[PDB]
């Protein structure tokens, strides 16, 4: 998109001190990582999924059972969910240019909730942050238990720790922006 | 076997008028057909059993379901079963003849009645039992080109194709027809004896 400078710049103008630091983390360390490096790592997620079996359809059900949602698809959804509250406030500030307190605090509160929900979903669904080389599968029509092997498990572990750590930082930065605002009014 | 002439000749001597006809039909038109022709018709029965499927093990269980006992193996068992009552009596005839000489048309006089009559009666029952098994197990005497199979692990119903069904049908009809002829010949020998003693 050739208008990225305009929309990012528009958010940049209508932002506080920390809010400008938060924007550089979301765009440079999260959007670019998901676009230039991570999206190609997951290219052959199912094509290079190898199962030690002769059963037709066993590979399809086993990959589906262990990867109900791809990692890169989860991060694409999370990025969009933590992007609407910031832009909606930014558009409202532009329209205003009082009531801004109840929107700016709400957007920060919503972003923290969204970021913690996705991180929780990542942990519970994928039983940790480490991808295993071998998955044992016993769903129909696979006979007994079938051994299957994941494509690039180590590459995916490095990029998932990187994304989780950055999201953890975004939680901390949004907490301080609440602490800065909380002491102004109710303290 | 090199002693076939010996045993066939020995059985031939110790037999009645009709019983010698029964020997030719048994050996020429049942044993020779089974050995010379029939056995190699069934040689590739499972090798070219073809099933339209990708499921491992489906071919194994579908062939087993539809051919629990092979036709030629069924005929081999039947031939052995209907040969012993004839050979045992023929051996007993030699012993009876041995006793008289130690003191060539076979005639039944004394205890030979209850052995010969039983041997004829057993061979009729053995042949009918095998003919009944052939009909019941294979739902008739015609092999089908296509069999539909749904035993585990085959998914839903699988189409499978038999090797040389027409040639197998031709030899099945031939073996059953000859077996029925042997039954008719055996019943006549019962009729010949049944009017001598009890009539």
Swiss-Prot record, chain A:
Report the outcome of residue 159 to L: In DFNB1A; uncertain significance
Regions of this protein lying in the Extracellular compartment: 39-71, 125-157
Keyword Transmembrane helix set for record: yes
Binding sites annotated in the UniProt record for Ca(2+): 40, 43, 45
Result of mutating residue 82 to M?
A: In DFNB1A; the mutant disrupts cellular communication
Provide the effect of residue 71 to R. In PPKDFN; the mutant has a dominant-negative effect on connexin trafficking
* GO terms, biological process: cell-cell signaling; gap junction assembly; gap junction-mediated intercellular transport; sensory perception of sound; transmembrane transport
Query: Keywords in UniProt for this one?
Result: Calcium, Cell junction, Cell membrane, Deafness, Disease variant, Disulfide bond, Ectodermal dysplasia, Gap junction, Hearing, Ichthyosis, Membrane, Metal-binding, Non-syndromic deafness, Palmoplantar keratoderma, Transmembrane, Transmembrane helix
Q: Which residues cross the membrane?
A: 19-38, 72-92, 104-124, 158-178
Q: Which residues lie within the membrane without crossing it?
A: 1-11
Superkingdom of the source species: Eukaryota
Quaternary structure, per UniProt, is: A hemichannel or connexon is composed of a hexamer of connexins. A functional gap junction is formed by the apposition of two hemichannels. Interacts with CNST. Forms heteromeric channels with GJB4.
Q: What does this protein do?
A: Structural component of gap junctions. Gap junctions are dodecameric channels that connect the cytoplasm of adjoining cells. They are formed by the docking of two hexameric hemichannels, one from each cell membrane. Small molecules and ions diffuse from one cell to a neighboring cell via the central pore.
Spell out the family assignment given in the record's similarity comment.
Answer: Belongs to the connexin family. Beta-type (group I) subfamily.
Q: What is this protein called?
A: Gap junction beta-2 protein
Swiss-Prot record, chain B:
Q: Which residues form the signal peptide?
A: none
Q: Which domain of life is it from?
A: Eukaryota
Q: Which PROSITE patterns match?
A: CONNEXINS_1, CONNEXINS_2
Binding, Ca(2+): 40, 43, 45
Q: One cellular component GO annotation, for this chain's record? A: plasma membrane
Alphabetized UniProt keyword annotations: Calcium, Cell junction, Cell membrane, Deafness, Disease variant, Disulfide bond, Ectodermal dysplasia, Gap junction, Hearing, Ichthyosis, Membrane, Metal-binding, Non-syndromic deafness, Palmoplantar keratoderma, Transmembrane, Transmembrane helix
- Entry keyword annotation includes Lyase: no
Query: What does the UniProt entry say about where the protein is found?
Result: Cell membrane; Cell junction, Gap junction
Outcome of residue 148 to R?
In a patient with congenital erythrokeratodermia; uncertain significance
Q: What pathology is it implicated in? A: Deafness, autosomal recessive, 1A: A form of non-syndromic sensorineural hearing loss. Sensorineural deafness results from damage to the neural receptors of the inner ear, the nerve pathways to the brain, or the area of the brain that receives sound information.
Which named protein is this?
A: Gap junction beta-2 protein
Instruction: Tell me the organism.
Output: Homo sapiens (Human)
């Amino acid at each position: 998109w050739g208008t990225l400078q305009t929309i990012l710049g528009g958010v940049n103008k209508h932002s506080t001190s920390i809010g400008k630091i938060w924007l550089t983390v979301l765009f440079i360390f999260r959007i670019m990582i998901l676009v230039v490096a991570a999206k190609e790592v997951w290219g052959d997620e199912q094509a290079d999924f190898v199962c030690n079996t002769l059963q037709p359809g066993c590979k399809n059900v086993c990959y589906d059972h262990y990867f109900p949602i791809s990692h890169i698809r989860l991060w694409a959804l999370q990025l969009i969910f933590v992007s609407t509250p910031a832009l909606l406030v930014a558009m409202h500030v532009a329209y205003r240019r009082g009531s801004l307190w109840w929107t700016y605090t709400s957007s920060i509160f919503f972003r923290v909730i969204f970021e913690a929900a996705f991180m929780y979903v990542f942990y519970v669904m994928y039983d940790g942050f480490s991808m295993q080389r071998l998955v044992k599968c016993n769903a129909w029509p696979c006979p007994n238990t079938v051994d299957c092997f994941v494509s690039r498990p180590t590459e995916k572990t490095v990029f998932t720790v990187f994304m989780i750590a950055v999201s953890g930082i975004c939680i901390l930065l949004n907490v301080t922006e609440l602490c800065y605002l909380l002491i102004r009014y109710c303290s």
